[PDB]
Automatic annotation (TrEMBL), chain A:
Keyword Cell wall biogenesis/degradation: no
Subunit record text: Part of the 50S ribosomal subunit.
Protein name: Large ribosomal subunit protein uL16
Pfam families assigned: Ribosomal_L16
PROSITE patterns listed in its UniProt record: RIBOSOMAL_L16_1, RIBOSOMAL_L16_2
Organism: Escherichia coli
One GO molecular-function entry: tRNA binding
GO cellular component, one term: cytosolic large ribosomal subunit
Function: Binds 23S rRNA and is also seen to make contacts with the A and possibly P site tRNAs.
Keywords from the named record: Ribonucleoprotein, Ribosomal protein, RNA-binding, rRNA-binding, tRNA-binding
Family, as annotated: Belongs to the universal ribosomal protein uL16 family.
CDD domains: Ribosomal_L16_L10e (cd01433)
GO biological process, any: translation
InterPro entries: Ribosomal_uL16, Ribosomal_uL16_bact-type, Ribosomal_uL16_CS, Ribosomal_uL16_dom, Ribosomal_uL16_sf
Automatic annotation (TrEMBL), chain D:
UniProt-listed InterPro entries: Ribosomal_L18, Ribosomal_uL18_bac-type, Ribosomal_uL18_bac/plant/anim
Organism: Escherichia coli
Keyword RNA-binding: yes
Function: This is one of the proteins that bind and probably mediate the attachment of the 5S RNA into the large ribosomal subunit, where it forms part of the central protuberance.
Gene3D superfamilies: 3.30.420.100
Family of the protein in this entry: Belongs to the universal ribosomal protein uL18 family.
One term under GO cellular component: cytosolic large ribosomal subunit
Assembly information from the UniProt record: Part of the 50S ribosomal subunit; part of the 5S rRNA/L5/L18/L25 subcomplex. Contacts the 5S and 23S rRNAs.
Name the UniProt record assigns to this protein: Large ribosomal subunit protein uL18
A Pfam family hit: Ribosomal_L18p
Keywords: Ribonucleoprotein, Ribosomal protein, RNA-binding, rRNA-binding
From TrEMBL, chain E:
Family statement drawn from the similarity comment of this UniProt entry: Belongs to the universal ribosomal protein uL5 family.
InterPro entries: Ribosomal_uL5 (IPR002132), Ribosomal_uL5_bac-type (IPR020930), Ribosomal_uL5_C (IPR031309), Ribosomal_uL5_CS (IPR020929), Ribosomal_uL5_dom_sf (IPR022803), Ribosomal_uL5_N (IPR031310)
NCBIfam families from the UniProt entry: PRK00010.1
Listed PROSITE patterns: RIBOSOMAL_L5
Oligomer and partners: Part of the 50S ribosomal subunit; part of the 5S rRNA/L5/L18/L25 subcomplex. Contacts the 5S rRNA and the P site tRNA. Forms a bridge to the 30S subunit in the 70S ribosome.
Protein name according to UniProt: Large ribosomal subunit protein uL5
Lineage: Bacteria, Pseudomonadati, Pseudomonadota, Gammaproteobacteria, Enterobacterales
Highest taxon, organism lineage: Bacteria
Amino acid sequence: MLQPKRTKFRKMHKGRNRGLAQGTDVSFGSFGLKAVGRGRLTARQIEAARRAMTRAVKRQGKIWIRVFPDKPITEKPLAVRGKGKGNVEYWVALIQPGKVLYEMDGVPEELAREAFKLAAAKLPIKTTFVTKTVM
Amino acid sequence: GSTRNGRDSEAKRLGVKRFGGESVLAGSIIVRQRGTKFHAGANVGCGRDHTLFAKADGKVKFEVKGPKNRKFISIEAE
Amino acid sequence: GIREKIKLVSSAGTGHFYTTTKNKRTKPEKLELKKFDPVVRQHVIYKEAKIK
Amino acid sequence: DKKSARIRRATRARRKLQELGATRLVVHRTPRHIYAQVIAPNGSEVLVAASTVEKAIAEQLKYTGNKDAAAAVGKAVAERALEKGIKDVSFDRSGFQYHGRVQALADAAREAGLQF
Amino acid sequence: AKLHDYYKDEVVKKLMTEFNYNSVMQVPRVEKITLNMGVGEAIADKKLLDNAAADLAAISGQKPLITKARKSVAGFKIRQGYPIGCKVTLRGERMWEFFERLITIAVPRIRDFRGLSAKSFDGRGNYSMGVREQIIFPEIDYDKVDRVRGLDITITTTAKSDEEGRALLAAFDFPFR
RNA sequence: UGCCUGGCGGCCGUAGCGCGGUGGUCCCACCUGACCCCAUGCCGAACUCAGAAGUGAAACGCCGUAGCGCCGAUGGUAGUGUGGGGUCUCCCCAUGCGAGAGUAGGGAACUGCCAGGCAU
RNA sequence: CUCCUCCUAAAGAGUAACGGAGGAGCACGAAGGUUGGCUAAUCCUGGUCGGACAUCAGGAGGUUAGUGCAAUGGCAUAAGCCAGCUUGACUGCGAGCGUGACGGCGCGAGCAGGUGCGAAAGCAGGUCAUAGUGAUCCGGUGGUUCUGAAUGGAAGGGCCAU
RNA sequence: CCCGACUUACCAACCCGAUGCAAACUGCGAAUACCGGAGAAUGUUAUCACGGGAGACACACGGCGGGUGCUAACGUCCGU
RNA sequence: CGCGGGGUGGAGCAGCCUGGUAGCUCGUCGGGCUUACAACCCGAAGGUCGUCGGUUCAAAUCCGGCCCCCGCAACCA
RNA sequence: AAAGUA
Ligand SMILES: [K+]
Ligand SMILES: [K+]
Ligand SMILES: [K+]
Ligand SMILES: [K+]
Ligand SMILES: [K+]
Ligand SMILES: [K+]
Ligand SMILES: [K+]
Ligand SMILES: [K+]
Ligand SMILES: [K+]
Ligand SMILES: [K+]
Ligand SMILES: [K+]
Ligand SMILES: [Mg+2]
Ligand SMILES: [Mg+2]
Ligand SMILES: [Mg+2]
Ligand SMILES: [Mg+2]
Ligand SMILES: [Mg+2]
Ligand SMILES: [Mg+2]
Ligand SMILES: [Mg+2]
Ligand SMILES: [Mg+2]
Ligand SMILES: [Mg+2]
Ligand SMILES: [Mg+2]
Ligand SMILES: [Mg+2]
Ligand SMILES: [Mg+2]
Ligand SMILES: [Mg+2]
Ligand SMILES: [Mg+2]
Ligand SMILES: [Mg+2]
Ligand SMILES: [Mg+2]
Ligand SMILES: [Mg+2]
Ligand SMILES: [Mg+2]
Ligand SMILES: [Mg+2]
Ligand SMILES: [Mg+2]
Ligand SMILES: [Mg+2]
Ligand SMILES: [Mg+2]
Ligand SMILES: [Mg+2]
Ligand SMILES: [Mg+2]
Ligand SMILES: [Mg+2]
Ligand SMILES: [Mg+2]
Ligand SMILES: [Mg+2]
Ligand SMILES: [Mg+2]
Ligand SMILES: [Mg+2]
Ligand SMILES: [Mg+2]
Ligand SMILES: [Mg+2]
Ligand SMILES: [Mg+2]
Ligand SMILES: [Mg+2]
Ligand SMILES: [Mg+2]
Ligand SMILES: [Mg+2]
């Protein structure tokens, strides 16, 4: 479960999530899982997908996670009415279309495709399989 | 529960009062600022709170001058 | 607010006084300064006294 | 660096003089020579000048790098300025201490007639 | 003065032949000699700093300058501005006389002396050594000392490297080991 | 008229660093002494004074050199004012404005006043 | 619950919530004026006690320091550091301007008188700036070419300082 | 005993190269909006000042930019 | 949940307020008295202060979280 | 004055 070791501030404005992603190329491995949709990825989701991927490849090759959950999300407890911002409960990464979420190397393409499909089944956002390009 | 926040200070109405090319009388405030984001040029004074004000009648002129690319305000005599 | 108010009384005998404050615990010595007396219209010596 | 230190020393007074729009009497001192210039308020035009590297001044001096030479240069620059009809300048010690040769030059200029 | 004349009359040509300098201004020179006493016990008794300064003045023939702490340090219980040392800077004739005295009298009187280390160079041709006891200087009377006191001696040289610094020092018959 | 140097400016990295070379008649610098004018919370180091034996070593100036800094299009992309639309958390269309980053490329400053030296 | 700093705040000002974060209710006759001078943190190497960290020397570095106290905006011509002399932390005024519903609050050249520092040009009407605060009434103290219930005084009142 | 000599399941600070994120980050930086000047056309002076008379100081929804809430509410609090 | 108060040698309790190594009683250990034990007498040791961060030249101490404990309150229909 | 136990 990824989460910043420390932060300047405990709570963050909701903000919005417009635009296209930066970091749209396979930069470290040979294969990638890329977001086609827009949304939030919780640390639990990132880790559930990481587990699925890693077990699919039998801990062979190498795996990079290109996104990090650095945005804290607060909630108000049940049966509370104002009275200040709620408590931080989990952490998310904001995802825009085109964002490469994970990369893989050191395995055959068919196995990478299978592992990535198993991983995408854990995620709330539509994704697509990509490969490294020379330019 | 309750919050430990909830405080603020009154707005200080700083900023540029007379923009480039405006005709002003001597004494007119040109900019209110904390410290010297803008610096005093010809016919301009810098007060104790770093307010820049006209020392002569004329037209406001902004420029960038010197080795540090600093911003100066002067008054062109009209 | 440890500093106490004091007056500086003109030595010219006019009764003119300035007022200020003083940390009496750290500087027990009497304050003495040359200041402008507008009654005689000259700078003269002014000496510390009680505020009233 | 000595030169950079002296330039830093001189900058505040030079900026004040420029802001005041004064005509400068700028002095430059070296171990061997001393120089004086009268510079217009724009800072880029020289009205009169005098130094110990001029033959007409150096030929009358035993040594060009002492107080006597400084006084001669001050007198000469003041006379040339008065001939041009200036009469009103501000002294610019250029980061040198107001002392010794620099002071002797200034005193000679004052005696010869420059008002500062 | 004697060591200065010795420098100008033999050491310059020795070093010029040794290092093939193209200019006499390239020859390493002895810029200054700085003596320092780190009297860290003055915080308990400032009079110890006074005694150390008197000893330094006797040794160098010059009034020492008291040196204060640059910043507060918790480990040594010192606040910024606490007087904790004394130093003397020697140049010119005083430097040369002290250099001669140290070479010819004080250094031989070092307890169990077997030569000074040749590795005590900072990398730029400056030498630093530590004197454990001030009594090696005849200007200090062994009977009137209230406490043994050491010091640091730094010879600052215009040499560009350790080899040139050690060559210059050895040209004066420095007692290297 | 040209070359070199000093002072004061304009300008404020295309102008600054680095690396290599080079200059002492003059100028500059280091430099030589200091009882003195003046000075060191010690030190003639600095400041100051009196000088001119030595050296361009350092510094400085000049020349060369893209290893950097710096500058930098065209095109596209992002955003966006107004009007319209959709599957409306976000977008699209018409019109107008149009980056930042990156790419090609540029690039080892230019210049005014006065003074001095040399050649002419 | 009043005051200050940031963000929210949509690149002029202003802008709400029991929105997100921190501070004030002082300090200083020098920590104020001015003249002259100066430049940081951190690390590496060498050096008696001395060590991770004391003082010394050199190098790298270039403000990553500093600012009487929050935060922001500033600061090398320093507003940061040191020293000499000092009281401009002056009195009367004030072109003009900013900011407020108002009461108010703020910036201000320049004029008169007297002053400090500087050879001089000049700078100085507190402090790098922005918090450090409390209307009116009622009274207290000093001053005063004002008033003084028949008149001279006095009481009380006004005005100025507090 | 002082030393030391190797090795790492190893952890690895600094620096170098590559990849993202920020309301309280900025070596860049729009569109708009705002201040000022000039010019034409148009507009029943639409502007400013002073004076007589008020009402009003419970707002609602919709668009856009946001805080809060769950990018919940025919929710709540600002800007337009 | 809200408001307070706390956490320091093996046990109970001071110091905290207000920044510069922290103590008492019982207990433990060694010795002594006793035939032996207890009581008694002499001597000695034992905690960087609940856990982390922040401020600071320096934190048991000040500030901010987190864990455990105690006491109040958690209501009108 | 204070002397418990095996
Ligand atoms: K050296
Ligand atoms: K260049
Ligand atoms: K704003
Ligand atoms: K002062
Ligand atoms: K002073
Ligand atoms: K007003
Ligand atoms: K009265
Ligand atoms: K009557
Ligand atoms: K009266
Ligand atoms: K809303
Ligand atoms: K609205
Ligand atoms: Mg936004
Ligand atoms: Mg983004
Ligand atoms: Mg504010
Ligand atoms: Mg010299
Ligand atoms: Mg050279
Ligand atoms: Mg373009
Ligand atoms: Mg561009
Ligand atoms: Mg170059
Ligand atoms: Mg605004
Ligand atoms: Mg706006
Ligand atoms: Mg409004
Ligand atoms: Mg409102
Ligand atoms: Mg509010
Ligand atoms: Mg408070
Ligand atoms: Mg100064
Ligand atoms: Mg008026
Ligand atoms: Mg006057
Ligand atoms: Mg005077
Ligand atoms: Mg005041
Ligand atoms: Mg101050
Ligand atoms: Mg302040
Ligand atoms: Mg009453
Ligand atoms: Mg009567
Ligand atoms: Mg009467
Ligand atoms: Mg307009
Ligand atoms: Mg109301
Ligand atoms: Mg209302
Ligand atoms: Mg309402
Ligand atoms: Mg409303
Ligand atoms: Mg909305
Ligand atoms: Mg309806
Ligand atoms: Mg509603
Ligand atoms: Mg709604
Ligand atoms: Mg009831
Ligand atoms: Mg029993």
